[PDB]
Design a protein around this ligand. Structure first.
Ligand SMILES: OC[C@H]1O[C@H](O[C@H]2[C@H](O)[C@@H](O)[C@@H](O[C@H]3[C@H](O)[C@@H](O)[C@@H](O)O[C@@H]3CO)O[C@@H]2CO)[C@H](O)[C@@H](O)[C@@H]1O
Ligand SMILES: [Ca+2]
Ligand SMILES: [Ca+2]
Ligand SMILES: [Ca+2]
Length: 484
Protein backbone atom coordinates (compact mmCIF):
# COMPACT_ATOMS: atom_id res chain seq x y z
CA UNK A 1 0.00 0.00 0.00
CA UNK A 2 1.72 3.19 -1.23
CA UNK A 3 1.67 6.46 0.80
CA UNK A 4 0.10 9.67 -0.65
CA UNK A 5 -2.68 7.80 -2.52
CA UNK A 6 -6.05 6.14 -1.84
CA UNK A 7 -7.12 2.82 -3.35
CA UNK A 8 -10.80 2.07 -2.58
CA UNK A 9 -12.59 -1.27 -3.01
CA UNK A 10 -16.34 -1.45 -3.60
CA UNK A 11 -18.57 -4.14 -5.07
CA UNK A 12 -19.41 -4.11 -8.81
CA UNK A 13 -23.17 -3.67 -8.24
CA UNK A 14 -22.76 -0.29 -6.42
CA UNK A 15 -22.27 3.27 -7.69
CA UNK A 16 -18.50 3.12 -8.14
CA UNK A 17 -18.43 5.66 -11.03
CA UNK A 18 -20.29 8.12 -8.75
CA UNK A 19 -17.68 7.39 -6.06
CA UNK A 20 -14.77 7.90 -8.49
CA UNK A 21 -16.25 11.39 -9.17
CA UNK A 22 -16.22 12.17 -5.41
CA UNK A 23 -12.54 11.02 -5.46
CA UNK A 24 -11.76 13.35 -8.38
CA UNK A 25 -13.17 16.20 -6.22
CA UNK A 26 -10.77 15.10 -3.41
CA UNK A 27 -7.77 14.94 -5.77
CA UNK A 28 -8.37 18.44 -7.08
CA UNK A 29 -8.54 19.86 -3.51
CA UNK A 30 -5.64 17.91 -1.92
CA UNK A 31 -3.51 16.72 -4.85
CA UNK A 32 -4.08 13.12 -3.63
CA UNK A 33 -4.80 10.55 -6.38
CA UNK A 34 -7.86 8.33 -5.68
CA UNK A 35 -8.54 5.01 -7.41
CA UNK A 36 -11.82 3.13 -7.12
CA UNK A 37 -11.66 -0.56 -8.06
CA UNK A 38 -14.27 -3.31 -8.00
CA UNK A 39 -12.41 -6.65 -8.18
CA UNK A 40 -14.51 -9.83 -8.24
CA UNK A 41 -15.04 -11.41 -4.77
CA UNK A 42 -13.27 -8.51 -3.00
CA UNK A 43 -14.83 -9.38 0.37
CA UNK A 44 -12.90 -12.72 0.29
CA UNK A 45 -9.77 -11.23 -1.38
CA UNK A 46 -9.51 -8.41 1.21
CA UNK A 47 -8.49 -10.65 4.17
CA UNK A 48 -5.79 -12.41 2.10
CA UNK A 49 -4.18 -9.21 0.76
CA UNK A 50 -4.45 -7.12 3.97
CA UNK A 51 -2.79 -10.06 5.76
CA UNK A 52 0.29 -9.38 3.53
CA UNK A 53 0.18 -5.54 3.98
CA UNK A 54 -1.61 -4.89 0.66
CA UNK A 55 -5.06 -4.23 -0.85
CA UNK A 56 -7.12 -1.03 -0.61
CA UNK A 57 -6.88 1.87 1.85
CA UNK A 58 -10.74 1.73 2.20
CA UNK A 59 -13.18 -1.23 1.92
CA UNK A 60 -16.92 -0.95 1.18
CA UNK A 61 -19.25 -3.84 1.97
CA UNK A 62 -22.30 -4.61 4.07
CA UNK A 63 -21.71 -4.58 7.80
CA UNK A 64 -22.14 -8.37 8.23
CA UNK A 65 -18.54 -8.97 7.07
CA UNK A 66 -16.84 -6.41 9.39
CA UNK A 67 -16.74 -8.38 12.70
CA UNK A 68 -14.63 -11.07 11.00
CA UNK A 69 -12.22 -8.44 9.68
CA UNK A 70 -12.05 -6.67 13.08
CA UNK A 71 -11.57 -9.95 14.99
CA UNK A 72 -8.51 -10.67 12.78
CA UNK A 73 -6.98 -7.20 13.39
CA UNK A 74 -7.47 -6.03 9.78
CA UNK A 75 -9.35 -2.73 10.45
CA UNK A 76 -8.45 0.56 12.10
CA UNK A 77 -10.66 1.75 14.93
CA UNK A 78 -12.57 4.81 13.72
CA UNK A 79 -13.00 7.59 16.31
CA UNK A 80 -14.99 10.59 14.98
CA UNK A 81 -16.06 13.65 16.99
CA UNK A 82 -19.54 13.46 18.57
CA UNK A 83 -20.51 16.43 16.39
CA UNK A 84 -19.82 14.20 13.36
CA UNK A 85 -21.62 11.18 14.90
CA UNK A 86 -24.74 13.29 15.56
CA UNK A 87 -25.08 13.77 11.76
CA UNK A 88 -25.88 10.02 11.22
CA UNK A 89 -28.77 7.95 12.66
CA UNK A 90 -27.80 6.20 15.96
CA UNK A 91 -28.99 2.74 14.86
CA UNK A 92 -26.56 2.83 11.87
CA UNK A 93 -23.64 3.30 14.29
CA UNK A 94 -24.91 0.21 16.22
CA UNK A 95 -24.45 -1.90 13.06
CA UNK A 96 -20.70 -0.99 12.91
CA UNK A 97 -20.00 -1.43 16.66
CA UNK A 98 -17.96 -4.57 17.38
CA UNK A 99 -16.84 -5.25 20.91
CA UNK A 100 -17.42 -1.68 22.15
CA UNK A 101 -15.37 -0.22 19.24
CA UNK A 102 -16.69 1.53 16.11
CA UNK A 103 -14.98 -0.31 13.18
CA UNK A 104 -16.42 1.41 10.04
CA UNK A 105 -18.41 4.39 8.72
CA UNK A 106 -22.05 3.60 8.04
CA UNK A 107 -23.23 4.90 4.63
CA UNK A 108 -26.66 3.47 3.75
CA UNK A 109 -29.37 0.98 4.69
CA UNK A 110 -30.66 -1.50 2.14
CA UNK A 111 -33.36 -4.17 2.11
CA UNK A 112 -34.75 -6.28 -0.72
CA UNK A 113 -38.20 -5.39 -2.16
CA UNK A 114 -40.62 -6.89 -4.67
CA UNK A 115 -40.16 -5.15 -8.03
CA UNK A 116 -43.09 -5.51 -10.56
CA UNK A 117 -43.89 -4.46 -14.12
CA UNK A 118 -47.09 -2.33 -14.00
CA UNK A 119 -48.05 -3.12 -17.63
CA UNK A 120 -47.91 -6.89 -17.11
CA UNK A 121 -49.28 -6.70 -13.58
CA UNK A 122 -51.18 -3.60 -12.42
CA UNK A 123 -52.08 -5.45 -9.16
CA UNK A 124 -49.20 -7.66 -7.87
CA UNK A 125 -49.93 -10.63 -5.50
CA UNK A 126 -49.81 -10.10 -1.75
CA UNK A 127 -48.94 -13.80 -1.04
CA UNK A 128 -46.29 -16.30 -2.23
CA UNK A 129 -49.06 -18.91 -2.55
CA UNK A 130 -50.69 -17.01 -5.51
CA UNK A 131 -47.47 -16.98 -7.58
CA UNK A 132 -47.72 -20.48 -9.15
CA UNK A 133 -51.23 -19.98 -10.67
CA UNK A 134 -50.13 -16.51 -11.79
CA UNK A 135 -47.09 -18.05 -13.53
CA UNK A 136 -49.36 -20.61 -15.27
CA UNK A 137 -51.60 -17.87 -16.71
CA UNK A 138 -48.60 -15.70 -17.82
CA UNK A 139 -46.89 -18.67 -19.54
CA UNK A 140 -49.91 -18.94 -21.87
CA UNK A 141 -48.95 -15.41 -23.00
CA UNK A 142 -45.19 -16.21 -23.41
CA UNK A 143 -44.24 -14.64 -20.03
CA UNK A 144 -43.23 -15.73 -16.51
CA UNK A 145 -44.32 -14.37 -13.16
CA UNK A 146 -41.06 -14.15 -11.15
CA UNK A 147 -37.28 -14.38 -11.67
CA UNK A 148 -34.58 -13.56 -9.11
CA UNK A 149 -31.07 -14.62 -8.14
CA UNK A 150 -31.30 -18.20 -6.78
CA UNK A 151 -27.47 -18.57 -6.56
CA UNK A 152 -27.05 -16.19 -3.57
CA UNK A 153 -28.87 -16.99 -0.29
CA UNK A 154 -29.47 -13.25 0.48
CA UNK A 155 -32.31 -13.43 -2.07
CA UNK A 156 -33.97 -16.66 -0.84
CA UNK A 157 -33.55 -15.79 2.87
CA UNK A 158 -36.69 -13.61 3.20
CA UNK A 159 -38.84 -16.62 2.29
CA UNK A 160 -36.95 -19.04 4.59
CA UNK A 161 -37.22 -16.58 7.53
CA UNK A 162 -40.97 -15.94 6.95
CA UNK A 163 -42.33 -18.94 8.90
CA UNK A 164 -39.50 -19.14 11.51
CA UNK A 165 -35.95 -19.56 10.15
CA UNK A 166 -33.24 -17.52 11.90
CA UNK A 167 -29.44 -17.23 11.75
CA UNK A 168 -28.26 -17.35 15.39
CA UNK A 169 -30.63 -17.24 18.40
CA UNK A 170 -30.43 -13.98 20.43
CA UNK A 171 -30.16 -14.98 24.10
CA UNK A 172 -30.36 -11.70 26.03
CA UNK A 173 -27.29 -9.58 25.33
CA UNK A 174 -25.48 -12.30 23.38
CA UNK A 175 -25.89 -14.44 20.24
CA UNK A 176 -25.94 -18.20 20.83
CA UNK A 177 -23.60 -19.31 18.04
CA UNK A 178 -24.42 -23.08 18.39
CA UNK A 179 -28.17 -22.38 17.99
CA UNK A 180 -28.45 -22.03 14.23
CA UNK A 181 -32.11 -21.60 13.10
CA UNK A 182 -32.21 -23.37 9.72
CA UNK A 183 -33.01 -26.97 10.91
CA UNK A 184 -36.63 -26.24 11.91
CA UNK A 185 -40.13 -26.72 10.40
CA UNK A 186 -40.54 -23.03 9.53
CA UNK A 187 -37.40 -22.82 7.47
CA UNK A 188 -38.26 -26.24 5.96
CA UNK A 189 -41.68 -24.93 4.83
CA UNK A 190 -40.03 -21.90 3.19
CA UNK A 191 -37.38 -23.86 1.32
CA UNK A 192 -39.92 -26.56 0.30
CA UNK A 193 -42.16 -23.92 -1.35
CA UNK A 194 -39.15 -22.69 -3.30
CA UNK A 195 -38.06 -26.17 -4.42
CA UNK A 196 -41.64 -26.92 -5.56
CA UNK A 197 -41.52 -23.73 -7.69
CA UNK A 198 -38.50 -25.27 -9.45
CA UNK A 199 -40.19 -28.71 -9.62
CA UNK A 200 -43.42 -27.30 -11.10
CA UNK A 201 -41.34 -25.45 -13.78
CA UNK A 202 -42.14 -21.92 -12.60
CA UNK A 203 -38.44 -21.20 -12.06
CA UNK A 204 -35.12 -22.53 -13.18
CA UNK A 205 -32.53 -23.60 -10.59
CA UNK A 206 -29.60 -22.02 -12.44
CA UNK A 207 -31.22 -18.51 -12.61
CA UNK A 208 -28.51 -16.04 -11.45
CA UNK A 209 -28.33 -12.25 -10.91
CA UNK A 210 -27.79 -11.25 -14.60
CA UNK A 211 -30.38 -13.63 -16.11
CA UNK A 212 -33.07 -12.38 -13.68
CA UNK A 213 -32.09 -8.74 -14.28
CA UNK A 214 -32.11 -9.05 -18.12
CA UNK A 215 -35.48 -10.85 -18.12
CA UNK A 216 -37.22 -8.23 -15.95
CA UNK A 217 -35.64 -5.27 -17.76
CA UNK A 218 -36.61 -6.69 -21.19
CA UNK A 219 -40.20 -7.40 -20.06
CA UNK A 220 -39.91 -11.24 -20.14
CA UNK A 221 -40.88 -11.63 -16.43
CA UNK A 222 -43.51 -9.76 -14.40
CA UNK A 223 -41.65 -9.60 -11.09
CA UNK A 224 -38.24 -9.74 -9.57
CA UNK A 225 -36.78 -9.38 -6.07
CA UNK A 226 -33.89 -6.96 -5.68
CA UNK A 227 -32.47 -3.93 -3.85
CA UNK A 228 -32.16 -0.15 -4.45
CA UNK A 229 -28.93 -0.55 -6.46
CA UNK A 230 -30.88 -2.24 -9.31
CA UNK A 231 -33.41 0.62 -9.89
CA UNK A 232 -30.95 2.66 -11.99
CA UNK A 233 -30.78 -0.02 -14.76
CA UNK A 234 -34.58 -0.43 -14.89
CA UNK A 235 -34.87 3.38 -15.25
CA UNK A 236 -33.19 3.30 -18.71
CA UNK A 237 -35.17 0.23 -19.89
CA UNK A 238 -38.71 0.38 -21.26
CA UNK A 239 -40.33 -1.06 -18.11
CA UNK A 240 -42.80 0.92 -16.00
CA UNK A 241 -41.92 -0.46 -12.55
CA UNK A 242 -43.26 -0.36 -8.98
CA UNK A 243 -41.46 -1.16 -5.71
CA UNK A 244 -43.55 -2.80 -2.98
CA UNK A 245 -43.72 -5.00 0.11
CA UNK A 246 -42.54 -8.58 -0.38
CA UNK A 247 -45.39 -11.13 -0.41
CA UNK A 248 -46.56 -12.96 2.73
CA UNK A 249 -45.96 -16.71 3.27
CA UNK A 250 -48.38 -18.67 5.44
CA UNK A 251 -49.94 -15.32 6.38
CA UNK A 252 -46.66 -13.92 7.70
CA UNK A 253 -44.41 -11.25 6.21
CA UNK A 254 -41.22 -12.09 4.38
CA UNK A 255 -38.30 -11.05 6.60
CA UNK A 256 -35.28 -9.77 4.69
CA UNK A 257 -31.87 -9.46 6.34
CA UNK A 258 -31.11 -5.75 6.37
CA UNK A 259 -27.57 -4.61 5.43
CA UNK A 260 -25.94 -1.33 6.36
CA UNK A 261 -23.42 -0.54 3.60
CA UNK A 262 -20.23 0.44 5.46
CA UNK A 263 -16.76 1.85 4.85
CA UNK A 264 -13.74 0.51 6.79
CA UNK A 265 -10.05 1.54 6.83
CA UNK A 266 -7.29 -1.07 6.28
CA UNK A 267 -5.09 -1.54 9.34
CA UNK A 268 -1.95 -1.65 7.13
CA UNK A 269 -2.83 1.64 5.33
CA UNK A 270 -0.22 4.41 5.59
CA UNK A 271 -2.95 6.92 4.52
CA UNK A 272 -5.38 6.75 7.50
CA UNK A 273 -5.87 10.49 8.18
CA UNK A 274 -6.46 10.95 4.40
CA UNK A 275 -9.00 8.11 4.32
CA UNK A 276 -10.71 9.65 7.38
CA UNK A 277 -10.80 13.08 5.65
CA UNK A 278 -12.21 11.64 2.46
CA UNK A 279 -15.05 9.79 4.20
CA UNK A 280 -16.03 12.48 6.71
CA UNK A 281 -15.79 15.62 4.59
CA UNK A 282 -16.30 14.39 1.03
CA UNK A 283 -18.42 11.24 0.86
CA UNK A 284 -20.70 11.76 3.89
CA UNK A 285 -22.20 15.04 2.70
CA UNK A 286 -25.30 15.79 0.62
CA UNK A 287 -23.04 16.35 -2.48
CA UNK A 288 -21.03 13.18 -1.91
CA UNK A 289 -24.03 10.89 -1.38
CA UNK A 290 -26.06 12.50 -4.23
CA UNK A 291 -23.19 11.72 -6.64
CA UNK A 292 -23.06 8.03 -5.63
CA UNK A 293 -26.90 7.87 -5.41
CA UNK A 294 -27.15 9.26 -8.99
CA UNK A 295 -25.04 6.36 -10.32
CA UNK A 296 -26.79 3.45 -8.45
CA UNK A 297 -29.29 4.15 -5.63
CA UNK A 298 -28.07 3.44 -2.05
CA UNK A 299 -31.41 2.89 -0.28
CA UNK A 300 -32.07 4.92 2.89
CA UNK A 301 -28.87 6.80 3.69
CA UNK A 302 -27.30 7.15 7.14
CA UNK A 303 -26.79 10.94 6.82
CA UNK A 304 -29.89 12.55 8.38
CA UNK A 305 -29.76 15.75 6.29
CA UNK A 306 -29.85 13.92 2.95
CA UNK A 307 -32.33 11.24 4.15
CA UNK A 308 -34.86 14.10 4.63
CA UNK A 309 -35.10 14.39 0.83
CA UNK A 310 -34.91 10.67 -0.10
CA UNK A 311 -37.79 9.66 2.25
CA UNK A 312 -40.33 11.48 -0.01
CA UNK A 313 -39.61 8.80 -2.67
CA UNK A 314 -42.26 5.99 -2.69
CA UNK A 315 -39.53 3.43 -3.41
CA UNK A 316 -37.54 4.36 -0.28
CA UNK A 317 -40.83 4.08 1.72
CA UNK A 318 -41.24 0.47 0.43
CA UNK A 319 -37.56 -0.33 1.12
CA UNK A 320 -38.03 0.86 4.70
CA UNK A 321 -41.32 -1.04 5.15
CA UNK A 322 -39.47 -4.17 4.03
CA UNK A 323 -36.54 -3.43 6.41
CA UNK A 324 -38.94 -3.09 9.43
CA UNK A 325 -40.52 -6.47 8.69
CA UNK A 326 -37.02 -8.04 8.71
CA UNK A 327 -33.92 -7.82 10.90
CA UNK A 328 -30.56 -6.06 10.78
CA UNK A 329 -27.86 -8.70 10.16
CA UNK A 330 -25.43 -9.72 12.95
CA UNK A 331 -21.83 -8.59 12.48
CA UNK A 332 -20.26 -11.45 14.49
CA UNK A 333 -17.28 -13.26 12.82
CA UNK A 334 -19.44 -16.43 12.24
CA UNK A 335 -21.72 -14.64 9.73
CA UNK A 336 -19.68 -15.62 6.67
CA UNK A 337 -19.68 -19.25 7.85
CA UNK A 338 -23.48 -19.00 8.18
CA UNK A 339 -23.93 -17.61 4.63
CA UNK A 340 -21.66 -20.33 3.12
CA UNK A 341 -23.77 -23.00 4.83
CA UNK A 342 -27.09 -21.55 3.65
CA UNK A 343 -25.70 -21.14 0.10
CA UNK A 344 -24.75 -24.84 -0.12
CA UNK A 345 -28.12 -25.94 1.32
CA UNK A 346 -30.24 -23.91 -1.13
CA UNK A 347 -28.17 -25.02 -4.16
CA UNK A 348 -28.37 -28.71 -3.09
CA UNK A 349 -32.14 -28.69 -2.45
CA UNK A 350 -32.84 -26.68 -5.64
CA UNK A 351 -30.75 -28.97 -7.88
CA UNK A 352 -32.31 -32.12 -6.35
CA UNK A 353 -29.11 -33.69 -5.00
CA UNK A 354 -30.61 -33.72 -1.46
CA UNK A 355 -34.00 -33.40 0.22
CA UNK A 356 -34.92 -30.11 1.95
CA UNK A 357 -34.68 -31.99 5.27
CA UNK A 358 -31.16 -33.41 4.71
CA UNK A 359 -29.84 -30.19 3.16
CA UNK A 360 -31.01 -28.03 6.10
CA UNK A 361 -29.94 -30.63 8.73
CA UNK A 362 -26.35 -30.44 7.38
CA UNK A 363 -26.15 -26.60 7.78
CA UNK A 364 -24.74 -26.26 11.31
CA UNK A 365 -21.95 -28.78 10.43
CA UNK A 366 -21.02 -27.06 7.16
CA UNK A 367 -20.98 -23.67 8.86
CA UNK A 368 -18.54 -25.06 11.52
CA UNK A 369 -16.28 -26.40 8.77
CA UNK A 370 -16.31 -22.96 7.11
CA UNK A 371 -15.53 -21.23 10.43
CA UNK A 372 -12.60 -23.57 11.11
CA UNK A 373 -11.06 -22.53 7.77
CA UNK A 374 -11.47 -18.85 8.72
CA UNK A 375 -9.76 -19.44 12.07
CA UNK A 376 -6.90 -21.28 10.33
CA UNK A 377 -6.53 -18.57 7.59
CA UNK A 378 -6.49 -15.91 10.31
CA UNK A 379 -3.78 -17.58 12.46
CA UNK A 380 -1.62 -18.21 9.35
CA UNK A 381 -1.42 -14.46 8.56
CA UNK A 382 0.90 -13.97 11.58
CA UNK A 383 3.64 -15.45 9.36
CA UNK A 384 3.50 -12.38 7.06
CA UNK A 385 3.53 -9.85 9.92
CA UNK A 386 6.57 -11.48 11.58
CA UNK A 387 8.28 -11.80 8.17
CA UNK A 388 7.76 -8.05 7.54
CA UNK A 389 9.85 -7.07 10.59
CA UNK A 390 12.43 -9.79 9.82
CA UNK A 391 13.09 -8.60 6.23
CA UNK A 392 14.39 -5.21 7.50
CA UNK A 393 16.80 -7.14 9.75
CA UNK A 394 17.94 -9.02 6.58
CA UNK A 395 18.52 -5.61 4.97
CA UNK A 396 20.56 -4.37 7.98
CA UNK A 397 22.57 -7.65 8.45
CA UNK A 398 23.66 -7.79 4.79
CA UNK A 399 26.10 -4.86 5.25
CA UNK A 400 28.46 -7.43 6.83
CA UNK A 401 28.02 -9.78 3.81
CA UNK A 402 25.64 -12.28 5.41
CA UNK A 403 21.94 -12.96 6.11
CA UNK A 404 22.73 -13.49 9.80
CA UNK A 405 23.41 -11.42 12.95
CA UNK A 406 25.23 -8.08 12.67
CA UNK A 407 28.71 -9.20 11.69
CA UNK A 408 29.77 -11.83 9.14
CA UNK A 409 28.26 -14.70 11.19
CA UNK A 410 28.02 -18.19 9.67
CA UNK A 411 24.79 -19.39 11.39
CA UNK A 412 21.51 -17.81 12.62
CA UNK A 413 22.08 -16.14 16.01
CA UNK A 414 19.37 -14.03 17.70
CA UNK A 415 17.83 -13.46 14.23
CA UNK A 416 14.60 -15.07 15.49
CA UNK A 417 11.25 -13.88 16.80
CA UNK A 418 8.38 -15.56 18.70
CA UNK A 419 4.70 -15.20 17.83
CA UNK A 420 1.44 -16.38 19.35
CA UNK A 421 1.00 -19.34 16.89
CA UNK A 422 4.60 -20.11 15.87
CA UNK A 423 8.18 -18.85 15.51
CA UNK A 424 10.13 -17.37 12.57
CA UNK A 425 13.82 -17.34 11.70
CA UNK A 426 16.14 -16.12 8.96
CA UNK A 427 17.93 -18.64 6.73
CA UNK A 428 19.85 -19.11 3.48
CA UNK A 429 23.18 -17.59 2.43
CA UNK A 430 25.10 -15.35 -0.04
CA UNK A 431 22.45 -12.94 -1.38
CA UNK A 432 19.79 -15.73 -1.28
CA UNK A 433 18.16 -15.00 2.09
CA UNK A 434 15.06 -16.87 3.31
CA UNK A 435 12.57 -16.60 6.15
CA UNK A 436 10.97 -19.68 7.71
CA UNK A 437 7.94 -19.51 10.01
CA UNK A 438 7.14 -22.76 11.85
CA UNK A 439 3.76 -23.31 13.51
CA UNK A 440 3.46 -24.74 17.03
CA UNK A 441 2.64 -28.46 17.41
CA UNK A 442 -0.45 -27.51 19.48
CA UNK A 443 -2.52 -24.44 20.44
CA UNK A 444 -3.38 -23.62 16.83
CA UNK A 445 -5.63 -25.22 14.18
CA UNK A 446 -4.81 -28.94 13.55
CA UNK A 447 -4.57 -27.98 9.85
CA UNK A 448 -1.49 -25.85 10.68
CA UNK A 449 0.18 -27.71 13.62
CA UNK A 450 3.87 -28.38 12.84
CA UNK A 451 3.76 -27.00 9.27
CA UNK A 452 6.17 -24.34 7.97
CA UNK A 453 6.02 -21.45 5.53
CA UNK A 454 9.35 -20.79 3.81
CA UNK A 455 9.85 -17.51 1.93
CA UNK A 456 12.45 -16.27 -0.51
CA UNK A 457 13.31 -12.58 -0.11
CA UNK A 458 14.43 -10.76 -3.29
CA UNK A 459 16.83 -7.76 -3.59
CA UNK A 460 13.80 -5.44 -3.70
CA UNK A 461 12.24 -7.24 -0.66
CA UNK A 462 9.18 -9.11 -1.98
CA UNK A 463 8.17 -12.37 -0.25
CA UNK A 464 7.73 -15.37 -2.61
CA UNK A 465 6.82 -19.01 -1.87
CA UNK A 466 9.76 -21.40 -1.40
CA UNK A 467 9.00 -25.05 -2.25
CA UNK A 468 9.99 -26.12 1.28
CA UNK A 469 6.63 -24.66 2.42
CA UNK A 470 4.19 -27.38 3.59
CA UNK A 471 1.47 -25.28 5.28
CA UNK A 472 -1.72 -26.15 3.30
CA UNK A 473 -1.72 -24.11 0.10
CA UNK A 474 -5.47 -23.32 0.38
CA UNK A 475 -4.99 -21.59 3.77
CA UNK A 476 -2.39 -19.18 2.34
CA UNK A 477 -2.94 -15.88 0.41
CA UNK A 478 -3.49 -16.69 -3.29
CA UNK A 479 -0.86 -14.08 -4.35
CA UNK A 480 1.85 -15.76 -2.23
CA UNK A 481 0.80 -19.22 -3.52
CA UNK A 482 0.93 -17.87 -7.10
CA UNK A 483 4.57 -16.78 -6.59
CA UNK A 484 5.42 -20.53 -6.36
O1 LIG B 1 -23.16 -16.94 -0.17
C1 LIG B 1 -21.73 -16.87 -0.22
C2 LIG B 1 -21.31 -15.48 0.23
O2 LIG B 1 -21.82 -15.27 1.55
C3 LIG B 1 -21.55 -13.98 2.11
O3 LIG B 1 -22.20 -12.99 1.31
C4 LIG B 1 -23.32 -12.32 1.89
C5 LIG B 1 -22.92 -10.87 2.20
O4 LIG B 1 -21.90 -10.78 3.21
C6 LIG B 1 -24.16 -10.12 2.63
O5 LIG B 1 -23.86 -8.77 2.94
C7 LIG B 1 -25.19 -10.19 1.50
O6 LIG B 1 -24.63 -9.65 0.29
C8 LIG B 1 -25.51 -8.85 -0.50
C9 LIG B 1 -25.21 -7.38 -0.19
O7 LIG B 1 -25.56 -7.05 1.17
C10 LIG B 1 -25.95 -6.45 -1.14
O8 LIG B 1 -25.53 -5.10 -0.93
C11 LIG B 1 -25.70 -6.86 -2.59
O9 LIG B 1 -24.33 -6.68 -2.94
O10 LIG B 1 -26.06 -8.24 -2.79
C12 LIG B 1 -25.34 -9.18 -1.99
C13 LIG B 1 -25.91 -10.56 -2.33
O11 LIG B 1 -25.26 -11.10 -3.49
O12 LIG B 1 -25.56 -11.55 1.32
C14 LIG B 1 -24.49 -12.40 0.90
C15 LIG B 1 -25.06 -13.81 0.75
O13 LIG B 1 -25.86 -13.87 -0.43
C16 LIG B 1 -20.05 -13.72 2.13
O14 LIG B 1 -19.84 -12.39 2.62
C17 LIG B 1 -19.45 -13.90 0.75
O15 LIG B 1 -18.03 -13.76 0.76
C18 LIG B 1 -19.81 -15.29 0.22
O16 LIG B 1 -19.31 -15.46 -1.10
CA1 LIG C 1 -49.01 1.47 -19.93
CA1 LIG D 1 -15.10 -17.01 5.83
CA1 LIG E 1 -19.76 -25.30 2.43
Amino acid sequence: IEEGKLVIWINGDKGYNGLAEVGKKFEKDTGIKVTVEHPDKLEEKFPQVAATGDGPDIIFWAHDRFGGYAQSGLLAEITPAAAFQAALYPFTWDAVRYNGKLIAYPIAVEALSLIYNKDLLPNPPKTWEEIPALDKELKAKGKSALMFNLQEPYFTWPLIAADGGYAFKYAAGKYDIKDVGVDNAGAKAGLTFLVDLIKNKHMNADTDYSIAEAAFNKGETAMTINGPWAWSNIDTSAVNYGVTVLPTFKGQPSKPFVGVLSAGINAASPNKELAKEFLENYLLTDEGLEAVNKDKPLGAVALKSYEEELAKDPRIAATMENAQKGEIMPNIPQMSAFWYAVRTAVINAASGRQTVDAALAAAQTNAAAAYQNYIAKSQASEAFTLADGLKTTINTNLQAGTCFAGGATAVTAADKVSGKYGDAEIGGSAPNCTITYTFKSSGVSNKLTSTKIVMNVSETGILTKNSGTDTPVELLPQSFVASG
